[PDB]
Amino acid sequence: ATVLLEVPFSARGDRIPDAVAELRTREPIRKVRTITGAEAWLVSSYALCTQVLEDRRFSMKETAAAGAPRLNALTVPPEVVNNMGNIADAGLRKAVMKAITPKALEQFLRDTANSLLDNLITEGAPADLRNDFADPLATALHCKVLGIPQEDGPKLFRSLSIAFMSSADPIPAAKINWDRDIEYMAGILENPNITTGLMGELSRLRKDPAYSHVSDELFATIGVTFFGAGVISTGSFLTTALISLIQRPQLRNLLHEKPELIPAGVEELLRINLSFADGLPRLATADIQVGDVLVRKGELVLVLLEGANFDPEHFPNPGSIELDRPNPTSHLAFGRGQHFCPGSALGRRHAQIGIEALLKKMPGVDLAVPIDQLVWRTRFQRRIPERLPVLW
Ligand code: HEM
Numbered sequence: 001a002t003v004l005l006e007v008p009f010s011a012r013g014d015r016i017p018d019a020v021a022e023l024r025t026r027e028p029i030r031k032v033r034t035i036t037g038a039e040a041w042l043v044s045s046y047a048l049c050t051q052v053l054e055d056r057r058f059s060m061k062e063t064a065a066a067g068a069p070r071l072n073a074l075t076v077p078p079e080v081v082n083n084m085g086n087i088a089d090a091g092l093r094k095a096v097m098k099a100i101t102p103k104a105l106e107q108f109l110r111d112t113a114n115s116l117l118d119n120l121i122t123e124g125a126p127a128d129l130r131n132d133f134a135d136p137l138a139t140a141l142h143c144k145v146l147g148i149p150q151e152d153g154p155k156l157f158r159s160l161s162i163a164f165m166s167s168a169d170p171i172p173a174a175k176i177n178w179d180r181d182i183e184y185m186a187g188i189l190e191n192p193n194i195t196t197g198l199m200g201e202l203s204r205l206r207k208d209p210a211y212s213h214v215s216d217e218l219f220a221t222i223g224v225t226f227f228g229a230g231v232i233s234t235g236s237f238l239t240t241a242l243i244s245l246i247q248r249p250q251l252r253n254l255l256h257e258k259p260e261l262i263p264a265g266v267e268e269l270l271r272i273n274l275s276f277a278d279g280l281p282r283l284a285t286a287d288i289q290v291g292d293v294l295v296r297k298g299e300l301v302l303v304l305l306e307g308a309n310f311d312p313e314h315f316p317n318p319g320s321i322e323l324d325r326p327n328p329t330s331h332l333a334f335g336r337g338q339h340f341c342p343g344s345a346l347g348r349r350h351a352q353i354g355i356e357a358l359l360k361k362m363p364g365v366d367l368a369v370p371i372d373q374l375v376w377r378t379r380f381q382r383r384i385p386e387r388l389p390v391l392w
Pocket of ligand 1: 060083100237336338339
């Protein structure tokens with residue numbers, strides 16, 4: 001006798017488990033047990049993953065309902081799961097988008113990357129590319145985008161190792177750090193020195209008559225959530241993309257020699273990325289046929305991003321980085337449908353400029369320890385190594 005198949009399969013972000021291609025072939029939608037003990041449907045083909053993400057009857061907001069089967073415990077108030085919907089309803093969507101584009105900024109990214117790298121070179125090998133390069137780069141970018149002081153970035157950043165946990169039970173430290181971070185953002189909206197970036201724009205709109213009935217809670221929430229999601233997602237993706245690049249010295253050499261090819265290489269590094277640790281969660285609001293399974297109202301569905309993005313029926317020779325594919329941006333790294341990532345262009349540009357600056361300064365970058373010695377963070381919403389030691 002064996003127990004029901006458990007998720008997630010492995011916290012390692014340097015290799016995809018053989019089980020993924022086995023499931024996809026034999027049972028592309030199948031029952032599994034989450035860390036809470038709840039049952040869920042795990043979806044692993046490109047076709048079925050797209051079907052779920054494009055049908056709003058599979059609901060993000062209803063995952064917060066009391067009594068529902070859960071992937072993991074909430075780390076935010078339940079109304080905050082419907083964050084984008086709340087922004088839209090307030091008439092703030094277009095203003096938020098415009099403030100988080102990369103086209104405002106790029107020269108600030110380049111100068112910041114180059115300064116971080118020069119400091120590593122001065123100190124001498126080994127260097128830690130996560131704690132002393134990718135995560136500070138992400139932190140600095142989001143303080144500039146929000147319009148807040150660079151010197152505030154480190155304390156906001158320290159909440160994230162707990163805020164983005166994937167836990168079976170509620171986490172007391174997440175509420176302590178949330179309430180404090182909300183009080184900070186509320187203080188920013190009342191600070192007359194803050195007149196640029198996303199928080200500068202929200203601070204103006206707050207006093208305009210067309211927004212007089214929008215709550216002060218929502219304005220502070222937008223600042224905490226966009227800082228947190230953008231900094232964890234960009235820092236974690238750049239770190240694990242740098243591992244994928246270092247393990248491919250022929251590609252590293254080619255991008256060094258021809259940096260025009262960096263945007264096509266970053267699109268492939270997004271396609272093969274293992275940064276999301278769990279499937280994307282949805283709750284069925286109706287009975288809906290998905291492949292051979294009739295999913296019932298009230299059941300939990302998990303959309304496995306690497307199931308879609310390594311599917312050979314959609315991307316032939318899926319484990320290989322190919323810079324001349326006919327369908328290069330059709331991957332699901334930023335999601336699909338109603339909830340498609342609002343920061344996609346800013347995330348692409350963070351990774352392009354970081355990689356471009358690294359290869360120019362350190363063309364002989366390599367790991368300084370055997371790859372099996374990297375320590376993979378567990379029970380977390382991302383897969384990341386705790387330290388990334390390199391030489392050059
Ligand atoms: C390479 C970097 C990034 C990746 C891989 C990424 C990935 C994703 C994914 C897969 C989703 C969909 C979640 C779902 O449907 O359940 C998403 C949504 C979201 N992302 Fe990103 N993201 C990145 C960068 C950013 C940045 C830079 C920001 C903001 C500054 C951001 C803010 C958000 C927000 C607020 C949502 C929720 C949208 C909603 O609920 O409608 N992300 N991201």
